Every structure is written in C-alpha cells, then in structure tokens.
Amino acid sequence: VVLATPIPEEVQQAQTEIKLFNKWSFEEVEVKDASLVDYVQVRQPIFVAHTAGRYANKRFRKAQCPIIERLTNSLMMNGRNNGKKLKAVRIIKHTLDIINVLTDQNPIQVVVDAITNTGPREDTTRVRRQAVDVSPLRRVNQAIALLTIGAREAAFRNIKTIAETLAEELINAAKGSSTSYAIKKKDELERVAKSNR
Amino acid sequence: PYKIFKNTAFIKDMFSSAMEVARFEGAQIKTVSGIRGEIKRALSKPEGH
Amino acid sequence: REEFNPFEAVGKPGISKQIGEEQRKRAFEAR
Amino acid sequence: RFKGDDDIPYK
Amino acid sequence: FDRTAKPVPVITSEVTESLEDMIRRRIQDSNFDDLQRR
Amino acid sequence: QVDDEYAATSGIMDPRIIVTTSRDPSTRLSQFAKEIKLLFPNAVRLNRGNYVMPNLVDACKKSGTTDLVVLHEHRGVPTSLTISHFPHGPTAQFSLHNVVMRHDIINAGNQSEVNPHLIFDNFTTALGKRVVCILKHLFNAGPKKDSERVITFANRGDFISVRQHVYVRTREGVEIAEVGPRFEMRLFELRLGTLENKDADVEWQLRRFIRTANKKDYL
Amino acid sequence: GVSVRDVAAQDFINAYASFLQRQGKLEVPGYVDIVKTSSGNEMPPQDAEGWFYKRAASVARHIYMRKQVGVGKLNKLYGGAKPYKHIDASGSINRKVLQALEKIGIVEISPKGGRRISENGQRDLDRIAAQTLE
Amino acid sequence: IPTHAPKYEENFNPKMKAQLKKERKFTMKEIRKDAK
Amino acid sequence: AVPSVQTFGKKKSATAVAHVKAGKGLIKVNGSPITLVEPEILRFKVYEPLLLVGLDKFSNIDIRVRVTGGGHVSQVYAIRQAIAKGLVAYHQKYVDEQSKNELKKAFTSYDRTLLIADSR
Amino acid sequence: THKIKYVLLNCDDHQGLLKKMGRDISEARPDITHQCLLTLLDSPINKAGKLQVYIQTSRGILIEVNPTVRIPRTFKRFSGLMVQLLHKLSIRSVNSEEKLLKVIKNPITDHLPTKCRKVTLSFDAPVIRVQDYIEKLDDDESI
Amino acid sequence: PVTLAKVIKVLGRTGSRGGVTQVRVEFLEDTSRTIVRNVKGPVRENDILVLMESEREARRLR
Amino acid sequence: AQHAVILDQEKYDRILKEVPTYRYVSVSVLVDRLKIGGSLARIALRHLEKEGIIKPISKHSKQAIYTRA
Amino acid sequence: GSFQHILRLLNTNVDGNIKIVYALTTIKGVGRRYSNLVCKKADVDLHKRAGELTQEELERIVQIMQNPTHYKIPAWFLNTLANNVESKLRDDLERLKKIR
RNA sequence: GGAGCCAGCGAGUCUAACCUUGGCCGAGAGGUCUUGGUAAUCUUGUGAAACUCCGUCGUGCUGGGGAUAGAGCAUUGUAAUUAUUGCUCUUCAACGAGGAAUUCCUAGUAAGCGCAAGUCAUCAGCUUGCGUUGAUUACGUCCCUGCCCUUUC
Ligand SMILES: [Mg+2]
Ligand SMILES: [Mg+2]
Ligand SMILES: [Mg+2]
Ligand SMILES: [Mg+2]
DSSP: OSSOOOHHHHHHHHHHEEETTTTTTTTSSSOSSTTTTTTSOOOOOOOOSSSOOSSSSTTTGGGBBHHHHHHHHHHHHHTTTTOHHHHHHHHHHHHHHHHHHOOSOOOOOOOHHHHHHOOOOOEEEEEEEEEEEEOHHHHHHHHHHHHHHHHHHHHHTTSOOOOOOHHHHHHHHTTTTTTTTHHHHHHHHHHHHHHHH | OOOTTTTTEEEEEESSSSHHHHHHHTTTESSSOOOOOOOOOOSSSSSOO | OTTTOOOOOEOOOOOOOHHHHHHHHHHHHHH | OTTTTTTOOOO | BBSOOOOOOOOOHHHHHHHHHHHHHHHHOOOOOOOOOO | OHHHHTTTTTTSSSSEEEEEESSSSHHHHHHHHHHHEEEEEEEOOOOSSSSOOOHHHHHHHHOOOOOOEEEEEETTTEEEEEEETTTTOEEEEEEEEEOOOOOEEEEEEOOSSOOOOOESSOOOOOHHHHHHHHTTSOSSSSOOTTTOOOEEEEEEEEEEEEEEEEBOOSSSOOEEOSSEEEEEEEEEEEEEEEETTTOOOOEEOOOOOOOTTTOEEEO | OOOOGGHHHHHHHHHHHHHHHHHHHOOOOOOGGGGSBBBBOOSOOOOTTTHHHHHHHHHHHHHHSSSSSOOOHHHHHBOOOOOOBOBBBBBBHHHHHHHHHHTTTTTEEETTEEEEEHHHHHHHHHHHHHHHHH | OOOOOOOOOOOOOOOOHHHHHHHHHHHHOOOOOOOH | OOEEEEEEETTEEEEEEEEEEEEEEEEEEEEGGGGGOSSSSGGHHHHHHHHHHOSSGTTTTTEEEEEESSSSHHHHHHHHHHHHHHHHHHHHHSOOHHHHHHHHHHHHHHHHHGGGGOOO | OOOOEEOOOOOTTTSHHHHHTOOOGGGGGGGHHHHOOOOHHHHHHHHTOOOOOEOOOOTTOEEEHHHHHHHHSHHHHHHHHHHHHHHEEEEEEEESSSEEEEESSSSHHHHSSSSBOOOOSSSSSSSOOOOHHHHHHHHSSOO | OOOEEEEEEEEEEEETTTTTTTEEESSSSSSSSSEEEEEOOOOOOOEEEEESSSOOOOOOOO | OOOOSOOHHHHHHHHHHHHOOOOBOOOOHHHHOOBOHHHHHHHHHHHHTTSSEEEEEESSSSSSEEEEE | OOOSSSSEEEEEEEEEEEEEHHHHSSSSSOOOOHHHHHHHTTTTHHHHHHSTTOHHHHHHHHHHOOOOOGOOTTTTTTHHHHHHHHHHHHHHHHHHHHHO
C-alpha cells in the first residue's frame, strides 16, 4: 500500500488483523477453567489498553471490560501513582515483552493462566469463621488485586523495576509455583477455609 | 497601605507587632478621603502588618 | 437536665466557651 | 563492651 | 476604639437556659408553626 | 403570607434537596455536610469533585430538585451556607458562627429522622418573614402531631441560633434533649435567581460599613 | 517535499544540533558552563559541551513552526516548576541563542516584533530534515 | 550477638525560641478573647 | 468545487475539526503527519479507524485535522472521533450508501465512541 | 504511664493515683516484667541469637524487643525507659543505628513465624519436661 | 478434584449474613442433582461456581 | 551492599562468558547476578549490543530488554 | 594503578566509589554545584569515579578550590535582645492579668 | 539535565501609571527603551502544571528530605545603616511507611496536577472558581446496629 502520508509496514500488518500493541494476537488465547469463561474477557481484540469505557455504571459491566485494561487500572494505585494510566499501559507493554522473552508462549496466555490459577476458590466469612464459596467475579477481582499488590511490594525498595517484577510474578503464578506471592495467599485462604469447613 | 485588592488592602506602621493588631481587630478606621473600613486580621509576617 | 446536655454522652474538650467568658464576666463586673 | 552484670552508663 | 460590626454572640449557660425555656414553653401548649398540607 | 416563588407549591410538593460542598472539601466539611443531610428529611449528599455550576444547576433542575445547599469552610471550620431555590431562585447566603458538630460529642448516638416540628421566633420584619418562608419550605409538610423531633430557629440580634431537640411529655413537664448541631447563621446576602446566575438582581444585601451597622437590626 | 514538520521532533533537534556543532560557526557565550538556564533548576545542564547547540536547534525549529516568537515566550516555553508555581526560564540564554542564530542567518529580526525564520534558514532546516529522513 | 545500650532521657519532656513562640500563641489567644 | 466534508469531534474541552476531500491519501493532524502524534503510546489509538476500515478507502482522499483544547488524551480521542465521522460523512455525500452502512457497522462493532460523542 | 512528669505506675511508689484511676493496684507491678526481661535477655540462648521477646501490655500494646538491647538492671531506669518507649513509640540505640525497642501492630500472629508451635504456661496443665518437648518438636518450626 | 455447579436460583429472604448469598446450584456432571450453597461475592443465575466439597449442605449463617 | 563500580578484567571476561546464556537480559539482571553497578550495566548493555552478543527487543529510557543472540 | 577506594582531600576522607562531584560534595563548604564547577575548571571528566583520579587531577582540583578568584570563579557564585523581648512579654502578661 | 509539549474560569490605566507583548542589559532576581489594550480586538493560543521521549544516578539516610543557620546580589518604601519581599552559594537536621484507636468515600467519584480572582459576610500560602490525568471495590441484604411506615392485630 502506497500513501501520500507514509505509513509503516507494521501498520498494514495490523490492518490485516488487530493485535495488542501490534505485537500479540487474541486468536489463540483461551481460558482453561470453564467457570471463569464468562468473566475474563479476551474475545474482542484491542490495540491499546486505554479505552476510557464505562464499566462502573452497572453491577456486572466490569466483566465485559478487557482483562488487560483491568490489569492496567489495578496497576496504577497508592496515591503517588493515581491518575497516571499512561505509565500503567507502558509498564504493561514492557511486562508483556518480558513475558514473551522469558517464555516463548504468548504473553496474554500467561496473564490468563495466572489469573485463573491465583483465583481463590473457597474463603471464610464471620458468623467464629465458616467456609463459603466465591463467585467467579470475586475470583477475578481478587486474582488481579493479589497479583498486582505482590508485584508492587516486590519492587517497592528494590533495584527491580515494576515491569520485571510483575512479569516474574505472573510467570510464577502461571506455573503454579509457591514463589508467587498471590499463590501463597490463595493457598493460605483455602487452608483457613478448610480448617473451618 | 502597601498592597491593595479592590476593597481589601494591607496596611503598615499602625502597629509595631501583631500583638497590637490583636487588641484592635474590628476597629473602625477610615481614610483622609473618608472611606470607612475595618481591621480584619493581623498578618503573621511582617510584624505589625 | 444536666445529664442529657453533653454540649454544656459527653462533649469533647474545648467545645464550650462558658469558663472563659464567665470568668472575664466577673472581672468586668469588678472594673 | 558490656559483659556479665555491668550496667549501662549513668549520666 | 470603635467597632464597625456586631460582635459574634457567645453561647453562655444563661442564653442556652433562656432558649430551652422558650422551647419547653412552646411545646407545653403545642404551639408549633409548621407547614400544613394543602 | 407565603412568597410567590413558593406559593405555587407551598404544601403541595414535598421538597427535594441536594447538599454539597466546595471543591476538595476537608474531612470536617464532609462531616459537616452529613448532619445537614440528616437535618433536612429529604436531603441527599452529593460529592462535588470537579462539578461545574452551570452543569450542577442544570442537572439538578432536570432531576426536579427543589433546593440546593452548598457549604464552604476554612481549615475544616464551616463558614458559609448558601441555599438556592429552583427553578428561578431566590438565593440566600449565610455565615456560620460558633459551629458545633455532633462529631464533637462522644457516645452521642443516632438521630431520629421523623418530620420535625419547626419553631421560628422573633421574626417580625418583612425581611424576617422572607427568611422564615425560605427556611420553612426546606422541610416536609404536615409533621405528625406526636412527631418527637423539633427544630428551632431563634432570631437574636440578626443571629439565627439553630438547635435540634427531642422531647418527652411527662406528667408535670416536658424535658428536651438537644441532638445537635449548634450553629448561628446570619443572612448577609439575598438574590432573585439561582446561585449560578452571578448577575441576578440582589433583593437585599448586608451593609457592614454603614455607621449604624454596629447597632442595626434586620430580622 | 520534505519539511521540518515531517520529521520527528527529537530526531530533527538532535541531528540539527549535531550539524551546528560540526559546523562550528555558532557563537556560544563564555558563561554557558556556569549557568543553570533557569531559576527553577537546581543544577546546571549535564551535557555541558552541546546543550547550547541543542537549545539553538530547538529555538530554530519553534521559529520554523511559528512565524514570530520573542524572548519572553521562549522563556515561558522553556520554563518549569520550582507550592511550585511555574517559574520562568533564563532570558539571557534565549537572547544569546537568538543573536547567534541570526548571526548564522537561520533567523532574523521580525517586523511587527519577534524573529522570523530566515529564507536561508528555511532551506537549511528543510535540508537537515532531508538528511534526517533517510 | 552484638550488644548496644538503649538511649533514653531520665525525665521525659514532651530551644528557648520555641518556648517564646509558644507563649506568644497563648498571649495572642488570650488577647483575642478579651478584645471580643 | 472539489468535493469536501467537514466534521467536529469532541471530548472534554478537546475539539477537533476534520476536513475530508477528494485526494491522494494525504492525512495530516495539526498540519503534521498522523505518524508524529504524541504521546507515542496512544498513537495507535489515533490509528484506530485507519486500520479498522483499511487504508484503501483513504488513498483517494485527503484528510486535515485541527485540534484545540483539553489535554493530550482528550485531543487523541477528538482526532479519532473526527476522522471516523469525517469518513462516514464523505462516503455519505460522494460515495454510495452501502459503503457508508458497512463503515458504520465496522466502527460501531469495534467502538461506538468513534461515531457517537461520549459527554461525561 | 501517667502525668503527675510521666511516670510508670507502680504498686508501691504510687497507691493513691491508681485508686483514683479505679484499677486494682495488685495488678500494677511492672517489676515482674522487669525481672523476666532481665533473665530472658541475659540467658545464653539470647547471646546465641535464637531468642526474641514479645510483650503484650495489659492495655493491649504489643512491643518489639530487639535481642541486641541491654535493659537497665535498676528498676528506676527500667521505668524511665518504658515511659520513653510508651510515649515515643520506639527507642533508638546510643550509636543511632537500630531501634532496639519498637511498638508494633497487633495481632501477634502476623509477626510470628509462618510455621510455629504455640504454648502457654499453665499450672493446671499436665507437667512436662521442657527438654523432651523441644526435642520431639520439628526443626524448621519454631516454639 | 473440584466440582462445577451452575446457579439456577438466587434464593431470597434467607436471613443470610450480609455479604453472603444463599443460592441453589445444579452440578454440571449431573443436572438432576441440586444443592444449596453460600457465596461470598456478586452472584447471578447461569453462573458456574467451583465447589471444593459436594457433600455439605448450606445452612443459614446468621 | 557493595556493588562493583569498576570493570576489572575478570568481570569483563565474566560478562562476555555468561551474558549469552541468560534468556532475559536487563539492567536489574546484570546487577543481581554479576553484582555490578547499574551505570556499568547500562554501559555494558550498550557495549554488548555493539558486538551483537545481545539483540534488542524494546528500548525505553528507564527500562531496556535484551536476549541472547 | 589500583583504584583508590578512599582518598584524602583538604583534610577530608572521600570514598572512591562515589562520582567526583558527589564525592567532593562531602567536603565542608563544597556543594553539588560548587563541586561541579570545580570539576569543570579542573578539566576532569565527570563520568569518572573518585578513585580513577590521577595525582595531577587531584592537585589541580586542590589549587582550584583554594584559589577560586585566581581561576575566574564568579564572585556571585562563591560564598540579649531575646531576653528583652521575653521581659516585655512578661510585663504585658502581668498587665493583662491585672486587667483580668 | 535536556527535548516534546496541551487547558479553562477571569482580571487589567483618567483626570492615571493597571495588565504588559516586543527590543536591549542583567547568572538570576531584576533593570531599561518602546509598544497594544477601558478590552470576544492588547497582555493571551495566558506554549499551566502534572504528563511523554532521550539521557545521568543507582538501594547507600544516596544525586530522597529541605528544617535550622551564615554570607552576599537586588526591589519596596524612608532617612533609617530600619525593616520588607525575591535570587546566588554554603550549611544539611528529624524522617526507612507510622501503636492503641479513629474519620470519610460509590463515576468523570476517591485520588494526583496546576491556572486565575481576592469583587461589603469568612478567607491571605488561606477562601472561591476554573481547567488537566483518572482509578479499585459495591451497586445486594435486613442477618448485627440504628431510623421509620402499616395493622380506619
Ligand atoms: Mg480530591
Ligand atoms: Mg477549599
Ligand atoms: Mg489544590
Ligand atoms: Mg445501597
């Protein structure tokens, strides 16, 4: 394609198909756990996370929001970062690149796998304490929160930047290894619920 | 006066310290021109303003 | 009457003005 | 170096 | 030195006593000046 | 007699009120808004972050609201209270003195939110009657005869003392317990229009530099 | 039809500053090493050798964008926060930059005020844009 | 293990210029109440 | 005269005026090529209609966008919305209506904010 | 602590003041805490770096005791330290490198090790041999 | 192993504690078998939950 | 912590030998594993890139990512 | 030669590992900007650490800070009552008490 | 440290000296010579900030922190070596996320960021307005607490 205003080749390669940051495909990503299928949304591809959509209007409008945008929103936190979504999307871009580097698997699949794995399946409520089941929406929300907070606390006072620590945390959550903070908290919660079962 | 904002203004040489201002807040004052006013509040810095 | 008047449940310190104005009120009477 | 029953300094 | 504006009134115990005497005295005969449905 | 602006709906349509604050309110002002909501039975507190006066009034007028209450502060000390009546005013501004919040009381308890009885006293002048009419119509009409809650506005030298009391009818007397807050509100400006319209005609304003201001009465 | 506006800002500025430094005809004041460029700045430029050339390139490019620009507006544009209340930049540096640029003939004194991009400077900036584009 | 002595005051007080400033605040407040 | 259409896109205080005329696929924003938009990370947000609808429809037109007001993100949104609405208007005026319907279907399926303004 | 200056309340030194407070003065003896801290701190295991001391004040205040600390053995300067600790919330070393005594947020569990065995001293409970008990407990865990 | 159960009815007026909802779920493995469970998060019908235990019967949690 | 501030010969050899092995290469990785200063890591990463030992994936001023060639 | 982990300049110990500017800032009377100007006049590369310095560089910096004017350091760049007030306050307090 | 770089609400000089573009001088602050504007017209696109890109630094109470203090260069009066508001350098403290407890908060909302006016109440690094970036979670329940409504039972 030739235009009076020159356009890069990658732009027509994206014209062929929509890819996140023009580098990742949404075609092959699948949620393995059936229960989480209709709360982790990856079917609609997006070039960039930033959407400025309305998802707080209705109770379950959040489910339709793309998972990557939810992760970016959860990344920007703690006051000193509030209002800075551009940095959040930049850090997520770097994190996806790091994920692809460490493991050749598609990074979006890694994110989905980490979210699925770290979701708490059973928790406790006060009555003493008694064990109760968790709605999948709460599973997704708690998974995102735990992943993000673990990644943040890892690099709070360390040379590691947010991109590398977040990538490592997602990796370890995806593999299911206990190294990931979120997996530790999930296992602790399930154990506590089992005790009060 | 030395600093003026429409009705509001800052005055100097009435008082040597803000302590003197404190005793005279709400005091009725006027210009030679006859414009009336009030001592609103002592400025912390400088003393007397 | 007094018990159910926390402003004069009990009020937090420094909320009232009575002890100040009253004490000076006696002084103004003396002058 | 404090040792045994030696007490912390008194000023 | 002259004052320009009325001073802020102070809530002394006597003022509260007078006002509450008024409130009680009003409620004794049920003298309420309240809005009535048309 | 009821004012022309309120005469059409006087006693017909229950007032709808929105209580709000200035941009970036302090915690105390946010607290102070809360009891003002609790003060008026039909009030709703609205967070004003970045809202615009043309936008706020236009949205409120669309929703069918009756009155809008906005609060100003100075270092967490409530300072002013402005009441604007829709759809075309009037707008009354007040200054709050010696404000005493219920948060200042330990173990205070919860309020009762029945339609309260209203007490207006020492309002004699024509301007005073206007103030009564404006304040009178914030509340719901036809309070129950056994309604246990009474709100009093006492005019003392142009300073309207505001208190909130709950009573009980005993065999030999009635005993009232104030619930708070305590604050004195003085009218200092009144416009024939919404608070947004800065150009609305001023029905009345407080002259403070006139020589008789120190001894002058208005209400 | 290459123009300055067809090239990325950072690329054009860096390349054009390099071109000035190689050219060696740009007068640089003797105090460049001892100035902070602004009151808000805490310490002076790190790139002592070439920062003046880079500022010259930036000023030239803005003058290309905007037909007439003066010292005060350059001061505001190159100013930053020191509460912090957006202190303006140093006027002496901007004035010396303008004087040096009009010495080169890149810019020149504007009627109606300010400086206009000189036609010689016009073709020059288009040229450096051209080499950058490859 | 290392041993370090604790640092503390024999009598705890919760320089003179600050003490001067504190009195100014007290005197200012008292003067304010009298004037009103 | 040369066929041309004009559209206005808006978000917050940012307002973008887009002129779309017959041409040779020349797209410019604030007088600059679309490829130099900043911030770079949101550049693809500007590219959205271009890559969604395909560059072939653009090769026969020139597009000029002027943006004022608001912040960078709001300006980006104004640009993308103005581009989309200008293309729809041009295909309405000087092209058959089936193409207009397909364009509108594509844009609405992807993101409705491209066409309908979102006033907060 | 209570202002008279702030002084640690004592069973013998102060009797009228605690009566005004309405607290039973029998349970107003910080020397028992003093004596324990002395023996715990002076025990060889503390010198070996295998012991940390936690203090749950009757009011609910939880205090961190760094093993490196050296509390005074005189009861008066013992009290002078804790009035400083209770009000300042922490104590700094003479060399100013580490906070020996620090107040910490309740509950105790979050500060305790992930794998730990918990026991109390109970006169009514069965009598055991400490040496055998610790031996039969695992190694990675803590007591 | 964890079972999967789809919500078929969101029960109301259960006296359940705030933040917990008593629901009826049908096991995916056997549609006929139905069990009452208690959920901690926002829950709606046609949603699938993971049951760690398929034997316990839900009881009001005050 | 005492991070090496100067590139001495055995560290220079250590960088060249090991950095091909790491799948993921960045400033933090060099600091953590080789115990070298951050500034040297940035210089080394620019250095290693010129010989082609490491290939760039993305270049951002604050964060740089690299892989074995 | 061997990197100098520690150095003695102007009767002050400076760590080798720190940069020249931020190592010399430790010297009393020497700030970040003053050290930077001294380094520039000394023609010493700022990117170098303190230990990489040669002896001629060190003595050049020495003669720099001891002789700033001689090397064209800018002049603008280079470097009871309370008791009476207390007594007046006491007198005022006493008078106010006398009124009160 | 450089480079990129975008708002809105407003204010502004007659028998005066207000907003001030542009030119020159000054490291800066500021000075100086002119100029447009009684104002949708000139200051002003108020080229605001935060924010983005490229670089230095690098887990070290460190290039974080700027309290306290010293020395100078200027403005304002006024005639004192008096203060006043700015800039330059040096000095470089506590502070390593904060107990018991406690307050508020549901969408352009919490939160971050600056610009403007001090227009009879209040406000002077405080009030109000304006604009920029912009979230997590809930949006279900009377189980606990509290407040109501109905039984013209
Ligand atoms: Mg806020
Ligand atoms: Mg405010
Ligand atoms: Mg602010
Ligand atoms: Mg609700």
